[PDB]
Design a protein around this ligand. Structure first.
Ligand SMILES: Cc1cc2nc3c(=O)[nH]c(=O)nc-3n(C[C@H](O)[C@H](O)[C@H](O)COP(=O)(O)OP(=O)(O)OC[C@H]3O[C@@H](n4cnc5c(N)ncnc54)[C@H](O)[C@@H]3O)c2cc1C
Lengths: 976, 976
């Protein structure tokens, strides 16, 4: 109502007048910090450098690291802004001061002292131990015992504390009603593998530590608040809160954060309230807007997910007022902490509490330490119940927090910045955000929508979590079939059968595969050759349409197709779903690529002449596919050849033949003309060379081992009698991929990314990291954390989402990988070797081996398993040299925050796909066109804009258009 | 001059007034011709179809041919325009087309012509008689044309005595108007010599002069007038010289005329020179001043060769030019008799008033118009001046087609005075405006201009004609040198020397070439490998700059570099120059292509992430080059490898090793860093496999024979120890190229294009036509004309421009080609075999063999010499089948005017470069990217937008830009 609004605006106006002139420290341009923040708000390029420098700063531990990074981020001393070895001391001290702005101490004992001082100034606190996204069980224990230690200290002191002044009640309690000891805990700091993919396991592990903390909290009648973090963990955290609450249904001092910036929150808050009523318990909510807005937006768009946050700032403000109102309406069962620095927001809560006549012991106000000082003073004066969020700890564990503060204070849409950095437009600042919302909503090829990668599986969703076990079960009702060849549109059975089994459980037979002899392979090639002329003459637009149809067919079977892979080749849930989406991506991308390349282009501009340049297919393509990306790679190579006008004879890998059969199913459903796609699984020793040597073959697409690929290249180079063309070769032959960890690397990112690159899908990826090359100065520290996280992971059946990795492809892979592991143990020193499950299954321990140098076999030879080599580089030059020391050059990674070292790696770390500050696997179509040279391939990049040309050859038609001195004028003619 | 101008306008106004609205027959919408033209003028698509149909019509000699072409040009009966309605359709259309041919032609034969001329005299018109024909194909045809004039003159000789003189104001009563000879004929010089070409300036003049003289003696015998028509700019200087010489042999004889074309920029000077020349020699001349008949042709032809357009490009400029020059002629009436040849009323009025103002005697100027055109204008002249002469051509439709289509173009052009006056209802004041007034009123990327092909040699220029013999003599002062290897910026000499000689005169030794052993090759490879890292790291823009410098260096030495080729490998003057310009083109094009490809593309649009896609070189490239395009292909392959950042070891063909040395000279002058380019001529039998097999070679660019190409492909496929990359193969392996001569083909165009395709440079081109496939129905006539033109050509030293072709490359080639000729002579039957010069030289006769079928060797094997197979196809489908019957697919041609047959060819005649209605050689950079598949190559096209990528491999750098939940927003980002 406009009546409540008026009272709110008028209260905001009084809040501002009582604050007149007083600015927050961060906006005081008479101190270094205010000058630095000011220039960051005025110069975006400078903000980016300063903020990144702050992040890397605590890792700059030598005089060399500091001096060089300063110059790389701020340029020469004669070139920096005026407010910016002496240079080292000046910057260090200023940056250190900026860090302690937001912390009440580095240590527990320091924190307690400073906390006891804040009470004397009249301030309550909620204490947080700085830390998040823990990397190991041992780290989670340190975090847990720190709270235990903190609570012991506070227990011994709270008895001596006078309760903060109030309107009455218990003088031993704060304001007469609030427990004097109040702490906040970050759930992800309690379990290093927190992941909604393993929902139940994440909840339990976190719950068990939270319960241990909660028990100590309750002993001193304290308050525990459970912080909310990134959207990825919101449902996990809600469930932790509910279970703990029900375990102690009568204990009222337990709170949960709810983030008004989430679209989910209107429902989440309704649900929680209804839940509390249903169970006859009381709850407490700290309502916040949200701390991870940029991250959530970015992460959502990188995965083609719904962005979980509102995208207009005033919508979070409007949501907050809505939800606060709802909470206050429900004050009988829901205690309320208002957590905002926004004077409009605060004034709104205050008026709503008055309008709903809410008792004062049912709501309090909270702000972050070091921030919005006058706002905080205003709250203290006018309401009297102010609690400071007071975090403590060191700069590296606190970095995420600290950077979030600088973001928060300097964002364009920051209420604080708009109030205290720009000429404050008080009326605009205090307007009902709903009105603001409505006004800003007011302001805001070939018929095909442009390409977008298919949405990734999203385990924050209940239905996605439930989908896998259901579809795995459904696949199990359909095992035991005999799969035939598919030639010229017909099923062809043979006598030679090879069973395909579950690698995590070999006694489970999934089906039997007919093998084609050379007679059937010959038939398929002949079928292909016969279908060719009509296919080649089919319009590129029509050909692309079949791919589009096949993509819709696949999209509709996404979870079913994934489940088959989970069982047949031992893909983890995410790995399986990613394999199918990539297949879909290839279909959609190559469709568009053929449509683009399908139209003849006029070349040259001379008059009286028309030159058209255009492409044509080659003929019969042999597609020889690997087992490790059984749908994605197969479909990529086959659809590529098919859309470009060729016809395909396709040999799937034996152990993934059912996945190969999925191509048959999809192209069938798309109505593909007979003979255009043929499925001929067979024994390579029987029909391998035959397929490659055949004179009717014009193109060979292959992915697999270097040995095989190089043999194919050599044999295909011969022109046999009758062979119309020199055989085109598309080969991808794997790698020995390294990630370099520079001495300034962010280890909290580096460690889990390295672990995933190495052991995701048991390391069975051409792209997998099999070498981590670590700079001398961070070696011991990085290695300890890597091994520590590794020890937390579990090896077991891929159908169980609690397992990090599982059995390798087949027994041959197991025997060969184990031999490599033994060689590695003699060359270096084992750092970690995981347990494996007892009994059947092709299990190889997750294995990390140190002491490795370029001369070693496991530093050179592709193992294609869960064996990671760790190599100690003396400096960054050697790290680069070592990275380039194999005969492969497929992928590579580097964790570094030195612009110079990154610039050097971009130039000199010459792999087909180099990744900076993330894992070196998970290449997406269009975004990361995939493939390398040297012994890794012939420089063809799947999923990119040069790929389709490899399956075709260009032709030019030149026409003399002049007849008897008369030529037609064309639009783009050079004329006069 | 406003006073003169006012008389002119007023006189024009009376002229239009006296016309009384009458329209010339072609603009009479009452008749079919008027309707056809009116609709052609309103609908450009119809115009194109109608004009092309008229062109092909006289060759539709059977009912099916006719019926089919009608449907193909105009569609089914029910869809074509009303005036086209009524095989009956064949009869109606035939009838209308014949009538429109008779509009512009006074008859088909001499006798018919004579009778119709007398009828015109009776109506008051004089005549200048022309025998339809131009651009003759043989001596036999030139003789037929000459004898037709002689026959014509004998007939008029007997008749003229009976003719009463046309009425005049005074003079001799036995002469027309009292002063003009009754017999006036016009002759086209290019109808008198089939090889008329300023490249053979003197030989062309003499041949034409010799026939012109015989005609002229007969003309003088009856006291007649002879006018020499002017044709395309290519022959203008030749025709002028022919006139000068004839005039001087008969300085007494006043009745010899010459056409000058006011649409030429040269014409002001040409008229001035001719006038002065006449004064210096004390002789009188006669000039028929015209604007010009070949405007579109000249514009197109100049643009296609990057020549200066010889014509004004604003129509009013030709008009203003005409008035200037006319005035100058009238002022010089003492020595220059004037024929005003124009249908433009403004022009005519200008001449008339200018002649009255200068009081020119009426016996010094007369008016002329084309028969069948501008009827009311023609009658207007008769009434006002009395002295009007019709240009009256005669002959058949095929010989008359050029003339006829010129008339259609002339009456229908947007800029046509007749169209504006009689179709477009233009304002008279505007039509009569001083054209000088009209003239006044009507008047790249990376800092680099867009690519343009280098200007071709232009032998209409006297300095160009004179340049060749002088540079050849200069080259002869440079003979006898020893050419060393060039390695790492140093000259390396070996003691194994091979002489290179003049193939047209083997006793002339051009120099001695050092041969590289395997030792020096290895040194070259090692030097390239060592220069590679710094070259690879050189800015692509900087790399391109070296190519541009090399281009500039070559452009300065164009004639010199050309002369070397004339002597060393026996290129003809134009062939040599075109080789050098093509080298320059590769340099300019590939520079620009590298600048385009050298900038990294952001790929994908996900935020928090940057993917950059870019290209890197491979390493050391072996360039193995042919002798047949010794600068062009060499510079092509090498500069491509170089600009993309590879280093080159270059093996020129032994017999063109000096041309190879030009690359050393050009790259030296460009300042290319040492080791980037190395020159190692050597014995294939010594260092061939060694260069190809070397572990440090990453790429091999080869152009030459299939046998060697396939050998290289096979050997390169093996990966030796130490070999970093799978060898990239770029191979161009020749062709067995056919041209199809369809039964509706324009034979006047086909014959000389086939001859040139087969015998240009002795047939030593991969692109050369070695098979001409001719439809049953035109075979005998095509062959007669082809053999007749061949017989006209002379075989001899390429330094003498009079020769069509000369000796082949070397002794081995001479013997091998001759064996093939003998093979062909036993498979088929010899149709033509030229004389060759006596004595020294590697001469092989220009040879044509008929009776050839697909199963014959010389229908399959590439001969690479002046041996043409003639094949007789039963129908179009067999022609296509036969065209596709070899293992090669490089180039191809088709002469046809059937939309369906062309479409079938575009689809089914699957060669790398297909040419419609022109020769299949002389592909230009950009306009015709050159190369094919099958046994002709591996689908790489030099001079095209896909070429550079073959010398590189793609790389992607993917960067996670988010730090601590903060990422910079980019422009191309998908956001909110
Ligand atoms: C004591 C306390 C505890 C907190 N605990 C947590 C926690 O456990 N988890 C958590 O996630 N947050 C938490 N927060 C909130 C977060 O740390 C910020 O302090 C808060 O979001 C800023 O809101 P505001 O009213 O102070 O400032 P404002 O300037 O009013 O609000 C800024 C907020 O708007 C939102 N926003 C910014 N841009 C947009 C946009 N384009 N579209 C939509 N919304 C936008 C963001 O949430 C941003 O934080 C807590 C805050 C306090 C004071």
């Amino acid at each position: 109502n406009s009546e409540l609004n008026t009272k709110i605006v008028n209260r905001g106006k009084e809040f501002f007048g009582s604050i007149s002139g007083e600015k927050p420290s961060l906006f005081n341009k008479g101190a270094w910090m205010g000058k630095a923040m000011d220039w960051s708000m005025q110069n975006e390029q400078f903000k980016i450098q300063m903020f990144r420098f702050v992040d890397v700063f605590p890792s700059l531990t030598t005089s060399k690291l500091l001096t060089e990074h300063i110059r790389e981020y701020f340029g020469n001393e004669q070139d920096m802004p005026a407010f910016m070895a002496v240079l080292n001391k000046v910057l260090t001290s200023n940056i250190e001061e900026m860090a302690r702005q937001f912390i009440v101490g580095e240590t527990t004992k320091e924190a307690v002292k400073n906390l006891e001082k804040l009470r004397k100034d009249g301030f309550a606190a909620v204490v947080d131990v700085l830390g998040e996204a823990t990397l190991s069980e041992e780290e989670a224990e340190v975090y847990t015992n720190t709270y235990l230690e903190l609570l012991e200290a506070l227990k011994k002191e709270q008895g001596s504390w006078k309760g903060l002044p109030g309107k009455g009640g218990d003088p031993g309690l704060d304001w007469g009603h609030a427990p004097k000891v109040n702490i906040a805990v970050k759930p992800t700091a309690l379990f290093c593998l927190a992941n909604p993919q393993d929902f139940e396991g994440s909840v339990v592990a976190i719950l068990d530590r939270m319960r241990r903390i909660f028990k100590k909290v309750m002993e001193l009648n304290g308050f525990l608040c459970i912080d909310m973090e990134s959207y990825r963990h919101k449902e996990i955290i809600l469930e932790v809160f509910r279970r703990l609450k029900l375990e102690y249904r009568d204990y009222p001092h337990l709170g949960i954060v709810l983030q008004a910036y989430l679209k989910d929150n209107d429902k989440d808050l309704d649900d929680l309230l209804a839940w509390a009523k249903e169970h006859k318990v009381q709850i407490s909510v700290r309502l916040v807007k949200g701390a991870y807005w940029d991250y959530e937006t970015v992460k959502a768009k990188q995965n083609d997910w719904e962005v979980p946050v509102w995208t207009i700032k005033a919508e979070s403000d409007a949501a907050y007022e809505r939800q606060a109102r709802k909470i206050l309406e429900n004050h009988q069962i829901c205690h309320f902490a208002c957590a905002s620095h926004n004077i409009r927001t605060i004034s709104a809560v205050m008026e709503m509490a008055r309008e709903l006549n809410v008792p004062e012991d049912r709501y309090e106000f909270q702000v972050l330490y070091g921030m919005a000082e006058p706002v905080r003073k205003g709250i203290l004066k006018v309401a009297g119940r102010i609690r400071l969020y007071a975090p403590y700890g060191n700069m590296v564990p606190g970095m995420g927090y600290l950077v979030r503060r600088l973001l928060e204070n300097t964002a364009n849409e920051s209420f604080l910045r708009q109030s205290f950095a720009e000429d404050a437009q008080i009326e605009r600042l205090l307007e009902d955000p709903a009105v603001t919302v409505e006004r800003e909503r007011a302001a805001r090829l070939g018929g095909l929508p442009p390409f977008n990668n298919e949405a990734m599986v999203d385990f924050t969703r209940a239905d996605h979590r439930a989908a896998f076990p259901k579809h795995i079960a459904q696949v199990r009702t359909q095992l035991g079939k005999t799969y035939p060849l598919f030639i010229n549109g017909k099923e062809v059975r043979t006598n030679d059968l090879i069973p395909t089994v579950n690698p995590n459980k070999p006694s489970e037979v999934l089906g039997q595969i007919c093998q084609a002899g050379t007679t059937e392979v010959g038939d398929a090639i002949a079928a292909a050759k016969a279908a060719f002329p009509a296919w080649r003459d089919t319009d590129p637009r029509t050909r692309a349409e079949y791919l589009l149809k096949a993509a819709q067919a696949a999209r509709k079977r996404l979870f079913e197709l994934s489940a088959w892979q989970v069982l047949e080749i031992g893909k983890q849930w995410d790995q399986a779903y990613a394999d199918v989406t990539e297949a879909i991506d290839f279909l959609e991308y190559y469709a568009r690529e053929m449509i683009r390349l399908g139209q003849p282009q006029r070349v040259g501009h001379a008059p009286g002449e028309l030159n058209h340049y255009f492409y044509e297919p080659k003929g019969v393509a042999a597609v020889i596919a690997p087992w490790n990306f059984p749908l994605a790679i197969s479909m990529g190579m086959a659809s590529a050849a098919i859309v470009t006008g060729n016809c395909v004879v396709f040999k799937p890998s034996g152990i993934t033949s059912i996945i190969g059969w999925h191509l048959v199913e999809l192209f069938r459903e798309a109505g593909l003309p007979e003979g255009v796609f043929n499925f001929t699984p067979g024994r390579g020793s029987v029909m391998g060379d035959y397929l490659v040597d055949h004179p009717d073959i014009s193109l060979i697409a292959f992915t697999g081992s270097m040995e095989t690929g190089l043999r194919i290249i050599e044999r295909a180079a011969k022109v046999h009698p009758g062979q119309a063309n020199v055989k085109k070769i598309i080969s991808e032959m794997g790698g020995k991929n390294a990630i370099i960890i520079d001495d300034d690397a962010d280890l909290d990112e580096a460690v889990p990314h390295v672990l995933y690159s190495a052991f995701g899908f048991q390391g069975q990826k051409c792209s997998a990291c099999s070498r981590v090359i670590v700079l001398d100065a961070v070696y011991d520290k990085f290695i300890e954390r890597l091994v520590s996280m590794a020890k937390a992971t579990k090896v077991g059946p891929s159908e169980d989402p609690a397992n990090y990795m599982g059995a390798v492809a087949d027994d041959k892979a197991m025997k060969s990988i184990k031999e490599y592991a033994e060689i590695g143990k003699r060359e270096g020193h084992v750092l970690y070797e995981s347990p494996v499950p007892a009994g059947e299954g092709y299990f190889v321990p997750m294995t990390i081996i140190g002491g490795i140098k370029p001369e070693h076999r496991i530093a050179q030879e592709e193992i294609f398993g869960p064996v990671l080599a760790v190599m100690r580089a003396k400096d960054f030059d050697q790290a680069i040299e070592w990275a380039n020391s194999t005969q492969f050059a497929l992928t590579g990674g580097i964790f570094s925050r030195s612009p110079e070292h990154l610039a050097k790696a971009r130039r000199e770390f010459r792999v087909g796909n180099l990744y900076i500050n993330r894992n070196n696997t998970g290449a997406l179509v269009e975004r990361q066109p995939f493939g390398g040279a040297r012994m890794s391939g012939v420089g063809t990049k799947a999923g990119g804009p040069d790929y389709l040309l490899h399956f075709m050859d260009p032709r030019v038609v030149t026409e003399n258009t002049m007849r008897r001195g008369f030529a037609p004028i064309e639009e783009d003619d050079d004329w006069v």
